[PDB]
Amino acid sequence: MPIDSALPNFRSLTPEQRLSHLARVVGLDDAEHALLARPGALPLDTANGMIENVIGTFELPMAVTGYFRINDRDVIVPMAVEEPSIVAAASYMAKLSRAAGGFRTSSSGPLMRAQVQVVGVDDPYGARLAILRHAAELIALANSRDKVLVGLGGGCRDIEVHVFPDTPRGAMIVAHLIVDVRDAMGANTVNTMAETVATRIEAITGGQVRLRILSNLADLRLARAEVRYSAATLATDDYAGEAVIDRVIDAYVFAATDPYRAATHNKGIMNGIDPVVVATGNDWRAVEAGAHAYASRSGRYTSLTTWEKAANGDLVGTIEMPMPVGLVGGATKTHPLARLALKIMNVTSAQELGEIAVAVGLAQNLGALRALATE
Amino acid sequence: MPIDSALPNFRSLTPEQRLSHLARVVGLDDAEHALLARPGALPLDTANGMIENVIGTFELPMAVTGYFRINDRDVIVPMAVEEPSIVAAASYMAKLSRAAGGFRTSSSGPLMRAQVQVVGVDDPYGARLAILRHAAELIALANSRDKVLVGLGGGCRDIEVHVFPDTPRGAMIVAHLIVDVRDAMGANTVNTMAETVATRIEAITGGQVRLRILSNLADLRLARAEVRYSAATLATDDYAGEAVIDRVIDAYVFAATDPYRAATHNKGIMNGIDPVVVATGNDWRAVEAGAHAYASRSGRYTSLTTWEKAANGDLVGTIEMPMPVGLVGGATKTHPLARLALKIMNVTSAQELGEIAVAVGLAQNLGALRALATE
Amino acid sequence: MPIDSALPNFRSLTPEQRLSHLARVVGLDDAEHALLARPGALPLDTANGMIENVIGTFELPMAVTGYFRINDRDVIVPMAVEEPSIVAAASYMAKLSRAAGGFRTSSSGPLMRAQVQVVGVDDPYGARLAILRHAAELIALANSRDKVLVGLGGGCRDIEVHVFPDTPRGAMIVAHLIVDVRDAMGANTVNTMAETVATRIEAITGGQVRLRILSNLADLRLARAEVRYSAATLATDDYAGEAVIDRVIDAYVFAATDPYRAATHNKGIMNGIDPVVVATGNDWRAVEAGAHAYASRSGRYTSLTTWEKAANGDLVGTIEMPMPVGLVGGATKTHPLARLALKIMNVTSAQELGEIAVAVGLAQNLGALRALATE
């Protein structure tokens, strides 16, 4: 069912007119329409089961951004956020992306790391080699309590082991279980696997397992997007498109050079990403931590995007970053509007959701840089 | 008006009972009580003026966390978030902090950086010295359109200038206006100052000013908190308090050693901070970007907290990080519940809000580490 | 009283003729003239009170260098040194600077750092936060014994605190008192402040204060100078001025690239600076240490100057470095010729003296590079 994600005249429509349009285009029934149309879609009793000491609920404005097209498929994207201009800028940059075909995206697998930290070992490099020698057994043990995930094509795939010999608290060994978590965010799953393998790792190493916990630096679960714009597309009344393109690249190089700029440049990316994360019931703190920690992996805090001039003169943007979002658990299941957000987007895998999100972030970045370029 | 922030039996009370308690303790009138008690506190028309393409609103559960005491003053803290255990853990760690006096906090000034980026200069070090020679004039010019802020004791205080001689796009000079923004977050204020000084900087340097924009790496606007716990306080049925203390320190050293752990460790901090930021109408993306970029300032991504053993054996925790929150603009003014959140906390300066927030983050960090330590 | 600092025909005049000229131009009375005209201006008994085990005095030749103009004010500069060509080269480069207006200078404040080193602390990051929480009290305590300096507009302004957790002798905390010392060099003043705050810092931290002492890396007390020369100005019979300019820049880039060259390049700067420091009774070891330590602050020992080609083709030089000189104490007060040196220069603030000195150093640097360029 191919849709048009263009949002004609949305700036002049009332919220009820906007919802009528959305309901027609993405095929919402009347009860789904009514759920967005009236406050209180998250019943107090449901909220009271989600977190502790609930006294009520706190509303963010909820919007949709227009024109996104991801691997040739139009998608309307819900956003929950409080700051002006964000939704408009995302729409505008996705509108201008369409001449060169929208956004082209990919992902690495849905791979998450579970850390199993071992202390008290006198021969940590020997212990590391012992864990690696027993890797097949440990991977099987990790998979032993997750027959559903394995049946869906997921599960623990590999184990790596890092040694930190010189800490103020003695040598530490850290095993990482590398786990394919399919459409889940994956924390409970991998945390439980880390628990499951702990006593065997103690027997192999002679150490004491302390932390058994996912890493939020989810650098094996990357989402990527690329976009292109011509000079003709980016021309304005005051600037030739070639000048806009050069000034955007100039601004990007400033972020790639100076962490004081890169922090603002990447904040602008998250202005696009986090609202999609919130509106789907996902953990925005996890996405933030993975994004900004990844931005410093090189030894210097830098840009999560790149902007370049192609051989034919077009502007080309790219983004790549960790994107640990899911479809199956947490508030994504419990919040009635998170379920509806996923239906509006018609997403069927967590991978597709992550690629949509980073495309919005890439568009939001251009929106900021382009505006700063055209004064 | 000193209050008790203890929340007795809140886990067994209904949301209406919790709101009755809160209304009595912090002195909410019946209309404020009614505003939290019924969905829809953010009218659709108000939401429609906040962001573009609004179709409705999106609710987060809203809670309060208990027991916080900041420089000897009890405070009840609202939190808007979707994830379980966060509110309870913050309460528990603030409860246990009270034996040694709660949280002790401080801040640097409310100082924000506005970047003024200059391109096209052939003698950038000469241009830098020219800007510095004219610093008094440029600071006065920056203050020329902000008589209200200057009257409140704020304004541009200093100018520094950085030179990046070797970029792929030529040499860049970046002036920073260092601005005291009092109780505002400060973006519009400093962005406008950067605009105001641009043509004079062009005349002084012979270059072209491109970006004129705040930096979200707000490392001159730091909030700090310290807390202490004794062994007796941290003892459990399965672990002596001395063992809990050592295992918490062990976990902290793991984060200080390994960026894969530090990302999760700092995410846990933001689980405490961001909900307070959201509930007061503040920009959580800005707080996130400043926090995680600051965490990598040393050249390696590390912990925003420290945990140590004092001479008498007590556990001591500290946190320090950028905290660019405000009280005066944005959704903090527009959202009726953000105004009420500030009233619940009885805060009168943005500095006090930032210190409350980082204290919650420090408590949340301990909550995570302590739990991982006691299995 | 505007003077001309040109020194016409000084190379052919006797020392008595040179002194007659100087006495007329800067308005020395006959007793001041007589003091320079006859050996022994530092009485043996005065020398015997300055240092220990005095047996006599040791003469440096004393000269004046010509043509300097600092922010549009001509100044004649005394120099005490033993090496030929230094005075002549400084004069020649200041002479050639005049076509483009002489030297343009500025300074940061007269800010000195006093270090208060704390050992024996088990929770140093906690102790740091305690010091910072008590900063206002500690700054007031630092100012408590210096009412004269505070009345003159000086005094302790701020406190920062550094933690060194991993030393062979345990963790160290180092507080820095940041002190405005007005026209003094400032050592005794800041050392005394560091003493004054020590027992309170011990009470706050639970540690033992060891060193209480100024830092000679006076990187908050910077003097800066800029100068310009056209091609026409730098032309010689053998080289076009454009070639001289390119060869000077080439030599500068060699120093910025190679520490074996930078050491010689910066020695050449100090050939200009140190003689002015000696002739005013100031501590040349302190100026040297601050200069060369600052030259390695980037992690590699490099040039204290820069040389660049401006858009119109002119050569532009800059210098920036610590300049902790004073007017009020030490040999500057005790040595009769140091007092007269200050009168010859007509300086009224330590800031002005430091800017004159670094301008001479910048000129001396060009003198060396230009000569090496023209064979």
Ligand SMILES: CC(C)(COP(=O)(O)OP(=O)(O)OC[C@H]1O[C@@H](n2cnc3c(N)ncnc32)[C@H](O)[C@@H]1OP(=O)(O)O)[C@@H](O)C(=O)NCCC(=O)NCCS
């Ligand atoms: C806000 C902004 C989009 C207004 O753009 P503009 O030059 O005035 O452009 P237009 O009014 O011609 O609108 C262009 C497109 O932007 C979208 N748009 C602009 N204003 C919109 C609004 N109020 N509501 C909804 N969509 C809007 C639309 O897609 C519109 O085209 P469409 O109506 O054909 O779909 C533009 O200034 C921008 O992108 N600014 C950057 C803002 C930013 O980066 N914010 C983050 C931190 S400040």
Ligand SMILES: CC(C)(COP(=O)(O)OP(=O)(O)OC[C@H]1O[C@@H](n2cnc3c(N)ncnc32)[C@H](O)[C@@H]1OP(=O)(O)O)[C@@H](O)C(=O)NCCC(=O)NCCS
């Ligand atoms: C969740 C947690 C607080 C339950 O603690 P517990 O050992 O079972 O402790 P108790 O039931 O004795 O409660 C201790 C305190 O915690 C608070 N608390 C615990 N459960 C609570 C609940 N459901 N609702 C409200 N407050 C709760 C209260 O302050 C309580 O004391 P109080 O009733 O006197 O005010 C504890 O397990 C924890 O701190 N876990 C860490 C969770 C975490 O770090 N989440 C972030 C990522 S997973």
Ligand SMILES: CC(C)(COP(=O)(O)OP(=O)(O)OC[C@H]1O[C@@H](n2cnc3c(N)ncnc32)[C@H](O)[C@@H]1OP(=O)(O)O)[C@@H](O)C(=O)NCCC(=O)NCCS
């Ligand atoms: C020494 C040096 C100044 C002689 O320069 P020169 O090309 O022979 O130039 P001139 O004889 O035309 O003199 C030019 C100016 O230098 C000054 N000068 C040169 N020789 C001087 C001398 N013996 N006494 C006083 N001033 C002298 C004067 O300002 C003179 O102009 P003025 O008389 O109009 O005031 C020049 O070679 C130089 O600058 N060398 C660099 C020396 C150096 O860098 N030493 C440090 C380590 S080696």
Ligand SMILES: Nc1ncnc2c1ncn2[C@@H]1O[C@H](COP(=O)(O)OP(=O)(O)O)[C@@H](O)[C@H]1O
């Ligand atoms: N498409 C799917 N992808 C991943 N897991 C699934 C899927 N469908 C069902 N599951 C099961 O759900 C579990 C995770 O659910 P839950 O913890 O609620 O998810 P989340 O980690 O996203 O919060 C897996 O361990 C698996 O057994």
Ligand SMILES: Nc1ncnc2c1ncn2[C@@H]1O[C@H](COP(=O)(O)OP(=O)(O)O)[C@@H](O)[C@H]1O
């Ligand atoms: N207590 C205060 N602190 C700072 N600014 C204030 C205060 N009261 C009024 N103002 C004015 O408000 C302006 C900033 O308001 P606004 O842009 O709406 O704030 P924000 O930057 O927090 O979104 C300042 O430039 C100042 O003139």
Ligand SMILES: Nc1ncnc2c1ncn2[C@@H]1O[C@H](COP(=O)(O)OP(=O)(O)O)[C@@H](O)[C@H]1O
């Ligand atoms: N213009 C001035 N600048 C600084 N200090 C001054 C001035 N005039 C008098 N004083 C006093 O002199 C003191 C320093 O004198 P002294 O130790 O002899 O100077 P120095 O540190 O330069 O050797 C200050 O602490 C101050 O009280």
